[PDB]
Amino acid sequence: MVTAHFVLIHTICHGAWIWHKLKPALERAGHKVTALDMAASGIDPRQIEQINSFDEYSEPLLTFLEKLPQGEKVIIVGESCAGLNIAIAADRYVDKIAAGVFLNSLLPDTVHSPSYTVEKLLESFPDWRDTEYFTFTNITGETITTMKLGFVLLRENLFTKCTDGEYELAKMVMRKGSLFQNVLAQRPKFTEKGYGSIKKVYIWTDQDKIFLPDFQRWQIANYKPDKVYQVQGGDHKLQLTKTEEVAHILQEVADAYA
Amino acid sequence: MVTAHFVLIHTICHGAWIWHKLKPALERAGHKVTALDMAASGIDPRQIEQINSFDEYSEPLLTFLEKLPQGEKVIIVGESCAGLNIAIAADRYVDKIAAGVFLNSLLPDTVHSPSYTVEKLLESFPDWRDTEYFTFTNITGETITTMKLGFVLLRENLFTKCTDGEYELAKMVMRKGSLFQNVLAQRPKFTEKGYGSIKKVYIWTDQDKIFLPDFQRWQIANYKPDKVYQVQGGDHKLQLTKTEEVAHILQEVADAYA
Amino acid sequence: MVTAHFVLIHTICHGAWIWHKLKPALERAGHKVTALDMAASGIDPRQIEQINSFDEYSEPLLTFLEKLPQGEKVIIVGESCAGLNIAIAADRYVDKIAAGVFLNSLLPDTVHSPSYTVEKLLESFPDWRDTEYFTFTNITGETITTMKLGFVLLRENLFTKCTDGEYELAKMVMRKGSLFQNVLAQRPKFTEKGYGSIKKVYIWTDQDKIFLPDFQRWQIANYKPDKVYQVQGGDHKLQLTKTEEVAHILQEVADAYA
Amino acid sequence: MVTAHFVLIHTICHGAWIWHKLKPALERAGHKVTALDMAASGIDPRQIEQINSFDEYSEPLLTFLEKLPQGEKVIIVGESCAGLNIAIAADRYVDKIAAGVFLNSLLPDTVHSPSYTVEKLLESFPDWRDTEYFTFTNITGETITTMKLGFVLLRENLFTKCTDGEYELAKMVMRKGSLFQNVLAQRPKFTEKGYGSIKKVYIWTDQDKIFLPDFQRWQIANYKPDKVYQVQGGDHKLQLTKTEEVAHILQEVADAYA
């Protein structure tokens, strides 16, 4: 069918590694795939304590788009919190983005503060269990809250139905992350001409034990995506539990937005 | 049936992640498993350019043994170049080590320089293909050769029969490493009373496309292990291609020595 | 007379040792004094090549302020380039800083880039004589210029009127440093609400042979300090040539800002 | 009057800095002076944990002698524990040493174990007060005892009559050190043909509060030096309290043996 360039964007704490099954799957279909580490994530050499906002955290994505050859367009696929990276990138490089794909992901809008969908997430899922929290003071004095995801939360809430090998992989390479929420709160709203004007495709499952059904339904309702795909079964990490199905869906996205 | 504490030691460039399948396998049998990142490896925050020898590279292993409660013993399992870590650790903490297990690994001796088995490896396998090499000057002025493993080498020589997901994983989290060969060359020999006196179990396959058959046969011959297990099929990364079989071998090791 | 807690911050290449005379002088007057080594300076175990920006270099000062008990205030005294550390710290911990004291020091502002005063310094003093320069590539790929201060420069320009013992001391413990100037150039400006709102006291002499009179006069003009003290005679290192006089000035600072 | 090349060797924990007054003093008289940092001392980039014996600790001295032009001779001056460096160096490079000078120093012999004078020191001065002790396991599994000298011991026992500036200096740059005593104990004795044949000059004061009078008298008795100079007053650190007098004595050593 149509071939495309997917850019895969992991969530906070995680890394490009999270896409290790989906990347080859897509490449079996002849697509070009780039999986990037965001700052202080995966094997990026920076530590979270030197990162000051979610925009700074997004730097590898923005640098990648900047260097993207003119006339090429990419499809940016984002899991969980990475919808925020998609929104940010789209406000700087709208013309390089054929579509944005949201995979059990935060779905930001242009009408509320950037932090809105984060507030709502925490409203629906306030207890992160054995997760530990730390703080540091960023370069203009704002207290930033970082987290180290608890293994029980990993096992039961994120990687629920993943194999033991995958869960174990997650513990071996997980890093600290931050929502940068108090900094997001002060951030200008995402623009209609950038983020608002990209095609948006929302993939999810009702079996997600952290991005819960009412919350995801609420997101779809708050800000209508061009297409919604619901996948049966699986867990929060569909790129692991439902790899082939997600690949196929991404093909249809390519077919549509080209 | 005996239970044991296995400490899993990855090779240069790699990380604890390489054990993501074998760790849970062993845990299914009731064992305790620790997989460590060596310095500037996996997600360790240090960069290779601040590390000055193979002993310094080994620090997380040595720190772990140092803090191991008096009277506890571990079985150290090492892949590829990690036999050097095993030798180094054993010279410092012989009484904390029930056995050393060598998995398609360098098998050092006490009669030659510590660099010997490295020289012989490079003799048998001199061409590392699309691997790139870099250089830095360490804190006492020795030029250190670091490497970035080439993807073709990864695909064909290291992860030969691994799934695409594993191979792709490897590219997403591989780091630079170094043999520290010129520093190994000037290093005192491994002692009989430490490394020489631990139990040594050598597991390998003849299908290994970088640690080649004549080389591994030579290593067995140069320095006789207490027991040799040969696994049919698989590739250099048997902890991925032959996980269950390696688990079951490690149980026999535990039975014998734990 | 008012007592205070002075935190003494040395310049690049140097170390806490530089304050070996001024520290006990102040303590004779009943003050608390902390003299910190910045990263890769004095006897700090880190090497300059693992430090990536002037913010990272400032870490010990920021960690010290972070751990300072709520409601305690310090007076930060900085020589030469340490004004940058003062500016950085003040943007993060304004409420913990009673005043900032600048001793023949860079005096940054809020309207220009952080690098501005550095550019102007090099403008006025472009020839650093027998100083040697090196480079390394930092963790995000920027070339960093490091320097090893030449002994002639030490003798004639920095420690001009210091005893031969002090000069000789300097050669025995000096390390590499960096202005991190290209990284400063990209750095966000120092904020009004932090650095801009601290009390600023500028102490200097016209006998300084590296921070030259026109340059220091220009700094005072560019960014008016709350108080300016000029000390007659001495050299660049007034904490050595004019110890008692600097102590007495710092007392007036304590008396004022308390 | 004769000129000479003096090589100044500090004690454990300390560094070349300790000679910052004596070096220029001697240079006044036209001598050549080299003050070296031993391993993991002063600003040497190595940490004490990578150092495995007192021979390894001595490496900069031995490297210096090795590179000393054939036919040149030096006078090695050693304070406190540095007598051990003198003994070690002399057994390698006897023909490059005009004399050894011992300044309130350990005075080793050829009849007893290298550790003998250390045992006796600790016999006479067993309580090191607020000194902290740490431990690490060296390359062949020996536990090594390192120390961080306590400030009270510094003030009252080492730097007793030094100025406050000097004492303060010491706190700003002191590092960890080790006697390596258990390793010295296992070491081959110093040879008669090397160490035993060099000229030996012993300079001391009875006002030393750590190398006590009975102990120094005992050393002189145990192994007779060619000349003994006793300096009135001062403290353990005569290169600070009695600089000029020590310089003048070192002239006579030059006159005799250079």
Tab-separated table of C-alpha atoms in Angstrom, chain D residues 1-252:
chain	number	residue	atom	x	y	z
D	1	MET	CA	78.402	26.739	47.682
D	2	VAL	CA	76.850	24.170	45.367
D	3	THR	CA	73.595	24.051	43.428
D	4	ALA	CA	71.462	20.929	43.204
D	5	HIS	CA	68.208	19.473	41.993
D	6	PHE	CA	65.829	18.778	44.933
D	7	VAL	CA	62.816	16.525	44.459
D	8	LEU	CA	60.260	17.244	47.169
D	9	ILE	CA	57.992	14.423	48.242
D	10	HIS	CA	54.918	15.140	50.374
D	11	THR	CA	53.264	12.696	52.797
D	12	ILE	CA	50.081	10.655	52.399
D	13	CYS	CA	46.879	12.716	52.221
D	14	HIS	CA	48.880	15.800	51.312
D	15	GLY	CA	50.316	17.023	48.004
D	16	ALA	CA	53.014	19.074	46.297
D	17	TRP	CA	51.268	22.157	47.686
D	18	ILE	CA	52.841	21.464	51.093
D	19	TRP	CA	56.141	22.713	49.690
D	20	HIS	CA	54.786	26.047	48.438
D	21	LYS	CA	57.063	28.011	50.795
D	22	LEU	CA	60.188	25.843	50.666
D	23	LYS	CA	60.304	25.581	46.868
D	24	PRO	CA	60.864	29.293	46.191
D	25	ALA	CA	63.178	29.560	49.193
D	26	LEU	CA	65.508	26.981	47.647
D	27	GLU	CA	65.156	28.583	44.225
D	28	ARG	CA	66.397	31.848	45.709
D	29	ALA	CA	69.669	30.017	46.211
D	30	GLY	CA	69.781	28.964	42.558
D	31	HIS	CA	68.634	25.357	43.056
D	32	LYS	CA	66.386	23.407	40.768
D	33	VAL	CA	63.237	22.195	42.564
D	34	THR	CA	60.621	19.652	41.507
D	35	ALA	CA	57.574	19.128	43.750
D	36	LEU	CA	55.492	16.127	42.671
D	37	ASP	CA	51.989	14.941	43.505
D	38	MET	CA	52.067	11.219	44.308
D	39	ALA	CA	49.129	9.160	43.076
D	40	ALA	CA	45.667	10.219	44.338
D	41	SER	CA	47.299	13.130	46.143
D	42	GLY	CA	47.177	16.900	45.724
D	43	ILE	CA	45.412	17.431	42.423
D	44	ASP	CA	46.358	14.086	40.874
D	45	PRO	CA	43.234	12.890	39.074
D	46	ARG	CA	43.395	9.339	40.383
D	47	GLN	CA	41.275	8.346	43.376
D	48	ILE	CA	42.852	6.404	46.223
D	49	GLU	CA	40.591	3.402	45.524
D	50	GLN	CA	42.396	2.593	42.287
D	51	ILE	CA	45.761	2.444	44.032
D	52	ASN	CA	46.834	-0.956	45.268
D	53	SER	CA	50.120	-0.491	47.110
D	54	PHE	CA	52.622	2.038	48.336
D	55	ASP	CA	54.740	1.243	45.228
D	56	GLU	CA	51.800	2.170	42.991
D	57	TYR	CA	51.262	5.290	45.040
D	58	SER	CA	54.908	6.208	44.326
D	59	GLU	CA	54.519	6.081	40.540
D	60	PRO	CA	55.045	9.770	39.739
D	61	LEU	CA	58.364	9.748	41.620
D	62	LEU	CA	59.546	6.599	39.776
D	63	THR	CA	58.386	7.920	36.392
D	64	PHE	CA	60.259	11.162	37.143
D	65	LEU	CA	63.509	9.375	37.984
D	66	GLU	CA	63.110	7.119	34.955
D	67	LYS	CA	62.941	10.159	32.675
D	68	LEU	CA	65.738	11.956	34.519
D	69	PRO	CA	68.617	12.390	32.033
D	70	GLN	CA	71.424	9.851	32.441
D	71	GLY	CA	74.255	11.314	34.546
D	72	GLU	CA	72.066	13.732	36.491
D	73	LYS	CA	71.604	13.165	40.228
D	74	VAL	CA	68.858	14.462	42.536
D	75	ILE	CA	68.379	15.005	46.218
D	76	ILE	CA	65.066	13.567	47.310
D	77	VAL	CA	63.495	15.311	50.287
D	78	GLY	CA	60.654	13.485	52.017
D	79	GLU	CA	58.356	14.545	54.882
D	80	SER	CA	56.572	12.274	57.335
D	81	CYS	CA	55.621	9.034	55.537
D	82	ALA	CA	57.494	9.939	52.334
D	83	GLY	CA	60.589	8.173	53.625
D	84	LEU	CA	58.861	5.079	52.236
D	85	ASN	CA	58.825	6.642	48.771
D	86	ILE	CA	62.512	7.434	49.162
D	87	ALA	CA	63.304	3.831	50.068
D	88	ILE	CA	61.246	2.483	47.166
D	89	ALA	CA	62.732	4.867	44.608
D	90	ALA	CA	66.274	4.244	45.829
D	91	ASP	CA	65.898	0.501	45.192
D	92	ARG	CA	65.192	1.328	41.505
D	93	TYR	CA	67.377	4.293	40.746
D	94	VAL	CA	70.234	4.337	43.233
D	95	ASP	CA	72.652	5.980	40.774
D	96	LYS	CA	70.338	8.938	40.188
D	97	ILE	CA	70.134	9.880	43.844
D	98	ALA	CA	72.881	11.976	45.427
D	99	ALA	CA	71.174	11.703	48.817
D	100	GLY	CA	67.911	11.167	50.603
D	101	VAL	CA	66.698	13.762	53.089
D	102	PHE	CA	64.254	12.787	55.838
D	103	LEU	CA	62.193	15.629	57.325
D	104	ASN	CA	60.285	14.490	60.447
D	105	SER	CA	60.037	11.387	58.348
D	106	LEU	CA	59.768	7.674	58.607
D	107	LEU	CA	63.288	6.233	58.332
D	108	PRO	CA	63.088	2.696	56.930
D	109	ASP	CA	65.834	0.070	57.141
D	110	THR	CA	66.998	-3.040	55.209
D	111	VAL	CA	67.013	-5.478	58.107
D	112	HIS	CA	63.275	-5.314	58.915
D	113	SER	CA	60.102	-5.489	56.872
D	114	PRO	CA	59.212	-2.339	55.009
D	115	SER	CA	56.257	-1.904	57.464
D	116	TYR	CA	58.464	-1.887	60.568
D	117	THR	CA	58.815	1.888	61.068
D	118	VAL	CA	55.069	2.236	60.438
D	119	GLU	CA	54.279	-0.301	63.156
D	120	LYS	CA	56.490	1.601	65.522
D	121	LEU	CA	54.902	4.940	64.611
D	122	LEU	CA	51.433	3.602	65.425
D	123	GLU	CA	52.841	2.073	68.596
D	124	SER	CA	54.013	5.554	69.682
D	125	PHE	CA	51.045	7.437	68.267
D	126	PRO	CA	48.023	5.140	68.180
D	127	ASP	CA	45.193	7.667	68.491
D	128	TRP	CA	44.606	9.775	65.392
D	129	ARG	CA	41.747	11.562	67.040
D	130	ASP	CA	38.970	12.849	64.731
D	131	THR	CA	40.499	11.104	61.750
D	132	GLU	CA	37.911	9.026	59.811
D	133	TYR	CA	38.731	5.642	58.346
D	134	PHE	CA	37.407	3.948	55.215
D	135	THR	CA	38.124	0.701	53.494
D	136	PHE	CA	38.304	-0.739	50.016
D	137	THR	CA	39.280	-4.006	48.449
D	138	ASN	CA	42.262	-3.811	46.178
D	139	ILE	CA	43.034	-5.642	42.944
D	140	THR	CA	44.132	-8.855	44.663
D	141	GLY	CA	41.569	-8.859	47.453
D	142	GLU	CA	43.476	-7.213	50.263
D	143	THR	CA	41.474	-4.835	52.441
D	144	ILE	CA	43.127	-1.413	52.386
D	145	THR	CA	42.564	1.121	55.131
D	146	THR	CA	42.300	4.714	53.974
D	147	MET	CA	41.999	7.768	56.137
D	148	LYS	CA	40.615	11.268	56.070
D	149	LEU	CA	42.677	13.274	58.514
D	150	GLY	CA	40.631	14.960	61.250
D	151	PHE	CA	40.757	18.747	61.482
D	152	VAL	CA	41.688	18.652	65.163
D	153	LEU	CA	44.621	16.346	64.364
D	154	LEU	CA	45.550	18.736	61.528
D	155	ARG	CA	45.354	21.740	63.868
D	156	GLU	CA	47.049	20.378	66.979
D	157	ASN	CA	49.263	17.491	65.828
D	158	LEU	CA	50.417	18.197	62.251
D	159	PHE	CA	50.223	21.975	61.739
D	160	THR	CA	50.604	22.833	65.429
D	161	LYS	CA	52.504	26.138	65.071
D	162	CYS	CA	51.637	26.962	61.450
D	163	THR	CA	49.648	30.142	60.687
D	164	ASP	CA	45.905	29.923	60.390
D	165	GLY	CA	46.237	30.481	56.644
D	166	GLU	CA	48.369	27.374	56.243
D	167	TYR	CA	46.119	25.183	58.401
D	168	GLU	CA	43.112	26.430	56.544
D	169	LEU	CA	44.891	25.748	53.246
D	170	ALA	CA	45.428	22.201	54.405
D	171	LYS	CA	41.679	21.625	54.964
D	172	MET	CA	40.839	23.012	51.568
D	173	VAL	CA	43.100	20.576	49.665
D	174	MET	CA	43.704	17.510	51.845
D	175	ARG	CA	42.834	14.182	50.273
D	176	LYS	CA	42.468	10.622	51.487
D	177	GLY	CA	45.579	8.530	51.943
D	178	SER	CA	46.691	5.108	53.066
D	179	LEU	CA	49.701	3.562	54.772
D	180	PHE	CA	49.126	0.381	52.726
D	181	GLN	CA	50.502	-1.249	55.845
D	182	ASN	CA	49.296	-4.801	55.372
D	183	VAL	CA	50.657	-4.681	51.813
D	184	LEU	CA	53.965	-3.164	52.975
D	185	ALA	CA	54.173	-6.026	55.470
D	186	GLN	CA	54.140	-8.577	52.607
D	187	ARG	CA	56.643	-6.574	50.557
D	188	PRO	CA	60.261	-7.635	49.968
D	189	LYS	CA	62.760	-5.811	52.188
D	190	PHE	CA	64.591	-2.761	50.938
D	191	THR	CA	67.964	-3.821	49.474
D	192	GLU	CA	71.414	-2.868	50.766
D	193	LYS	CA	72.737	-2.167	47.282
D	194	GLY	CA	69.977	0.348	46.485
D	195	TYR	CA	68.330	2.086	49.445
D	196	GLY	CA	70.985	1.012	51.884
D	197	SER	CA	73.814	2.617	49.947
D	198	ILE	CA	72.366	6.130	49.513
D	199	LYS	CA	73.465	8.938	51.805
D	200	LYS	CA	70.827	9.708	54.434
D	201	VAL	CA	70.229	12.992	56.246
D	202	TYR	CA	67.682	13.204	59.039
D	203	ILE	CA	66.162	16.555	59.966
D	204	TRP	CA	63.749	16.837	62.867
D	205	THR	CA	62.488	18.788	65.868
D	206	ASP	CA	61.553	17.636	69.332
D	207	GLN	CA	58.443	19.860	69.140
D	208	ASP	CA	56.769	17.453	66.714
D	209	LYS	CA	53.376	16.415	68.139
D	210	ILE	CA	52.791	13.311	65.993
D	211	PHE	CA	56.268	11.978	65.228
D	212	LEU	CA	57.171	12.099	68.883
D	213	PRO	CA	60.712	12.561	70.313
D	214	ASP	CA	61.230	9.041	71.670
D	215	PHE	CA	60.027	7.665	68.305
D	216	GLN	CA	62.363	9.830	66.226
D	217	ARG	CA	65.263	9.138	68.609
D	218	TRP	CA	64.458	5.468	68.264
D	219	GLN	CA	64.577	5.741	64.442
D	220	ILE	CA	67.981	7.430	64.477
D	221	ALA	CA	69.141	4.651	66.815
D	222	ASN	CA	67.589	1.812	64.751
D	223	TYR	CA	69.279	2.971	61.544
D	224	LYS	CA	72.065	5.508	61.722
D	225	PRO	CA	71.865	8.359	59.230
D	226	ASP	CA	75.028	9.911	57.816
D	227	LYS	CA	74.083	13.245	59.443
D	228	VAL	CA	71.384	14.307	61.852
D	229	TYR	CA	70.165	17.905	62.038
D	230	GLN	CA	67.891	18.905	64.920
D	231	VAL	CA	65.899	22.107	64.460
D	232	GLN	CA	64.748	23.990	67.548
D	233	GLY	CA	61.053	24.859	67.798
D	234	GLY	CA	58.604	24.560	64.932
D	235	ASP	CA	56.210	21.672	64.459
D	236	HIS	CA	55.782	18.556	62.340
D	237	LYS	CA	55.633	20.730	59.192
D	238	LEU	CA	59.043	22.369	59.346
D	239	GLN	CA	58.823	23.287	55.657
D	240	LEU	CA	56.184	25.790	56.822
D	241	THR	CA	57.278	26.735	60.354
D	242	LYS	CA	61.031	26.687	59.729
D	243	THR	CA	61.266	27.210	56.015
D	244	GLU	CA	64.454	29.280	55.863
D	245	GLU	CA	66.263	27.053	58.320
D	246	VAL	CA	65.355	23.955	56.362
D	247	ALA	CA	66.496	25.662	53.142
D	248	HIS	CA	69.864	26.421	54.724
D	249	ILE	CA	70.259	22.842	55.961
D	250	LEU	CA	69.403	21.566	52.493
D	251	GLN	CA	72.206	23.769	51.170
D	252	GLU	CA	74.681	21.954	53.413
